[PDB]
Amino acid sequence: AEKVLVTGGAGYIGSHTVLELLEAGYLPVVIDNFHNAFRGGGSLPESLRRVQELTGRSVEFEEMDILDQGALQRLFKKYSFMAVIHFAGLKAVGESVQKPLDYYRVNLTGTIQLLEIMKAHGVKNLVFSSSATVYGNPQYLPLDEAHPTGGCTNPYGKSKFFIEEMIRDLCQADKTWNAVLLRYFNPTGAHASGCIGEDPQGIPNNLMPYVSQVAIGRREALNVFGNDYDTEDGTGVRDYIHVVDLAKGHIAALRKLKEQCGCRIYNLGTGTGYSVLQMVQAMEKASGKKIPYKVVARREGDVAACYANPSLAQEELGWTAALGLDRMCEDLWRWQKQNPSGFG
Amino acid sequence: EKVLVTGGAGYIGSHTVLELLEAGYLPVVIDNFHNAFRGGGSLPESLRRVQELTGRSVEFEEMDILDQGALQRLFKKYSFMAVIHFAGLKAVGESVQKPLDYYRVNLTGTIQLLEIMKAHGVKNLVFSSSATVYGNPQYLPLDEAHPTGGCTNPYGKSKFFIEEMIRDLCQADKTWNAVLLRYFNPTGAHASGCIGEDPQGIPNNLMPYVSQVAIGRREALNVFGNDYDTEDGTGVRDYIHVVDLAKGHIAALRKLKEQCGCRIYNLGTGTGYSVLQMVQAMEKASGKKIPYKVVARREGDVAACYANPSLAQEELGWTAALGLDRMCEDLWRWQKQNPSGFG
Ligand SMILES: NC(=O)c1ccc[n+]([C@@H]2O[C@H](COP(=O)([O-])OP(=O)(O)OC[C@H]3O[C@@H](n4cnc5c(N)ncnc54)[C@H](O)[C@@H]3O)[C@@H](O)[C@H]2O)c1
Ligand SMILES: NC(=O)c1ccc[n+]([C@@H]2O[C@H](COP(=O)([O-])OP(=O)(O)OC[C@H]3O[C@@H](n4cnc5c(N)ncnc54)[C@H](O)[C@@H]3O)[C@@H](O)[C@H]2O)c1
Ligand SMILES: O=C(CCNC(=O)Nc1cc(C2CCC2)on1)Nc1ccncc1
Numbered sequence A: 001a002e003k004v005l006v007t008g009g010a011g012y013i014g015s016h017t018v019l020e021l022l023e024a025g026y027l028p029v030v031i032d033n034f035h036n037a038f039r040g041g042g043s044l045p046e047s048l049r050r051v052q053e054l055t056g057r058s059v060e061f062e063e064m065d066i067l068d069q070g071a072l073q074r075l076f077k078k079y080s081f082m083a084v085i086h087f088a089g090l091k092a093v094g095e096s097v098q099k100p101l102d103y104y105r106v107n108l109t110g111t112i113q114l115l116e117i118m119k120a121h122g123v124k125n126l127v128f129s130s131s132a133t134v135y136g137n138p139q140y141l142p143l144d145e146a147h148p149t150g151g152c153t154n155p156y157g158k159s160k161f162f163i164e165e166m167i168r169d170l171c172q173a174d175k176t177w178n179a180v181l182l183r184y185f186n187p188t189g190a191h192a193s194g195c196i197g198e199d200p201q202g203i204p205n206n207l208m209p210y211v212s213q214v215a216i217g218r219r220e221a222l223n224v225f226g227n228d229y230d231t232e233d234g235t236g237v238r239d240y241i242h243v244v245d246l247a248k249g250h251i252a253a254l255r256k257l258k259e260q261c262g263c264r265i266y267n268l269g270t271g272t273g274y275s276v277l278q279m280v281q282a283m284e285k286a287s288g289k290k291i292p293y294k295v296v297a298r299r300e301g302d303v304a305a306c307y308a309n310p311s312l313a314q315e316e317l318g319w320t321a322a323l324g325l326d327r328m329c330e331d332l333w334r335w336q337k338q339n340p341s342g343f344g
Numbered sequence B: 001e002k003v004l005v006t007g008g009a010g011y012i013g014s015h016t017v018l019e020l021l022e023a024g025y026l027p028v029v030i031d032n033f034h035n036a037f038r039g040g041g042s043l044p045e046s047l048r049r050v051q052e053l054t055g056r057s058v059e060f061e062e063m064d065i066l067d068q069g070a071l072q073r074l075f076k077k078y079s080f081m082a083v084i085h086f087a088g089l090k091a092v093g094e095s096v097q098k099p100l101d102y103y104r105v106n107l108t109g110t111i112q113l114l115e116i117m118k119a120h121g122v123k124n125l126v127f128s129s130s131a132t133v134y135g136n137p138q139y140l141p142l143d144e145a146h147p148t149g150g151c152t153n154p155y156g157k158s159k160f161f162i163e164e165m166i167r168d169l170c171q172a173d174k175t176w177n178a179v180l181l182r183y184f185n186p187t188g189a190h191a192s193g194c195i196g197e198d199p200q201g202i203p204n205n206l207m208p209y210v211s212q213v214a215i216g217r218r219e220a221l222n223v224f225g226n227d228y229d230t231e232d233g234t235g236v237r238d239y240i241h242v243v244d245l246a247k248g249h250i251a252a253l254r255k256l257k258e259q260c261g262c263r264i265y266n267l268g269t270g271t272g273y274s275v276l277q278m279v280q281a282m283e284k285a286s287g288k289k290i291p292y293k294v295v296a297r298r299e300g301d302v303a304a305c306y307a308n309p310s311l312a313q314e315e316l317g318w319t320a321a322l323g324l325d326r327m328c329e330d331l332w333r334w335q336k337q338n339p340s341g342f343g
């Protein structure tokens, strides 16, 4: 066994991770159902067509849904996987509140079925792409891996917590499993080529893609949800990690599995949070554009500040984020300007 | 319209099917026989006997809640008003050994049920939960304000995760009505003696193990600890007569018609019983001596855990009538009439 399955590998973090896997000398097999990825003019998703050009290496790809048991069984019989990196899922928080059953079905049932097939095929090596929203509202900052988990405020976050708990119980029951749960906040930026990046369908949910679309002329003005928080400038402080650093952390996790590590949990991040206005300022600097905004009411449930402590990963995974705020913004801008409408 | 009872061939479900018929509802049961006994015809033996006890028909389909196609066809074939959901895996000790089976049956089965309910406009649910979702007690008796989610095994986690999914569904869609019923250990049996709990592989409470004793199929009960902070030093736990429990599921079903949204109620007698109290009550009911041996505690067991059922009295109009002596008398009658259960 010598392939790495990457579920959801056509998406934002997955496509960057497939690139890093290829550059690191692994042999990926990617599956995706195109729920949130654009089709290319050939078989590959456009993101992965471009990854093949960027790396000079071929991407093995199957269009399939991880909810389809028969397809998943056939996949694991056809390929000999040594590990799985699991990105396939739904991840829009506001959508999760409106459509909880879809989130529980894709995220929970999808992951359970993946685990069941992995077990059946003796593939017991997993990197799970988790979320630091599993810590709930912060009780101390920065959040480290000892901080309590649970008490999530939306179905997305609850789904990620529930999956973590299931994996932890699986590993307790069977000490031959190795699983690395990676917790992080907001992936930002893009591969330095500007050829791939986050390609939101419709009006972006999140700050940075919205700000980039204001800068390019695609959107009127940003809404800033509250400026009366207990933060330096009154706007909320959040944690942003360059997607390339994040992708490299998934490769470091894959290496940790080879140590027969059992169940391990690591935060990934830079260790420093930024306010909404700090991100807007840095995007004006990178883009050379004004980014108008208006301050509106706080959203119910939003906390003043949340950011992660990446010290454990810096020791045990050998991983450090190299790319700071200006690089995140410069790389997002380059993707945006080179691809004003995204992939399509 | 009919009432679907998932897992209705099993212990609590069969008693609830009987109470549905006694209350004037039309039951349809699904079960995969994972943990129930087949009759000599098309019905589970439990349900064949329920038909005799009531004089009424039970409709039954053998199927797995994990089979989406079977569930879709079920909801097209019958017109349901509501669902009472018992189908699941429930042995706490088994869940530690085989967690993925518990998550798959309990989580994926429930999610698929909720999605098919939604797809057919059936938005009224009674979920049979577990008071283990409270975790180790921080105060007693446990009421519905007590913290939840501190669960100590995969079974309890799965029940808590289901509750959270249902709460989020009800938040997203105010037209859903769902009653989540939390309780501890069902015991006893229908007073006919004709139905009860079949022999279990991995019991959650001491009363059958005990019932295997008084009849002579075990030597002595092991008592796990006699040094707890309890009246008599043995652990105090919460036991509800299965007939009272079943009737609480009917009260929950009626509450849905009030367009109650999401509601959560504990069911129980309101008083816990120690191990020695259970042994003494069983000796009284059976007329047999029940030897025991005190052994070390099991790691992680707490001194006492029992629920406050006051809110159910106020909002469901429900109380448990049957105390410990009646639980033991009714268990003993089932055991005497059916020493190996339905088999
Ligand atoms: N983006 C974030 O802010 C963030 C933060 C923390 C964790 N995560 C996690 O990262 C993962 C990837 O996030 P992303 O930002 O790249 O999102 P994304 O939507 O770009 O990528 C997810 C990919 O999964 C695919 N997919 C969805 N459902 C699938 C299914 N049933 N079968 C097969 N493929 C399916 C999508 O088509 C998409 O290409 C998810 O697990 C998410 O929870 C993301
Ligand atoms: N017995 C307890 O200690 C206890 C305590 C609290 C809550 N509960 C809950 O009560 C319910 C019923 O408990 P019970 O004591 O009557 O147990 P039981 O095992 O007698 O009944 C459950 C029934 O579900 C069926 N079933 C299991 N998996 C199924 C599947 N995939 N598809 C269809 N049917 C399936 C079984 O065959 C069985 O007849 C469960 O939801 C459980 O979590 C039980
Ligand atoms: O602007 C938007 C979406 C992007 N806006 C965003 O993420 N802002 C934020 C984020 C936060 C965090 C909570 C405290 C810190 O605080 N402010 N959408 C929109 C704009 C204009 N018209 C309609 C829709």
Ligand SMILES: O=C(CCNC(=O)Nc1cc(C2CCC2)on1)Nc1ccncc1
Binding pocket: B205, B206, B209, B210, B220, B221, B222, B223, B224, B225, B234, B235, B236, B237, B275, B301, B302
């Ligand atoms: O007796 C048995 C099993 C039944 N015994 C039981 O549940 N007792 C208990 C339960 C509790 C609770 C924890 C504190 C309250 O406290 N004691 N098993 C056995 C006997 C002999 N040989 C092998 C196995």
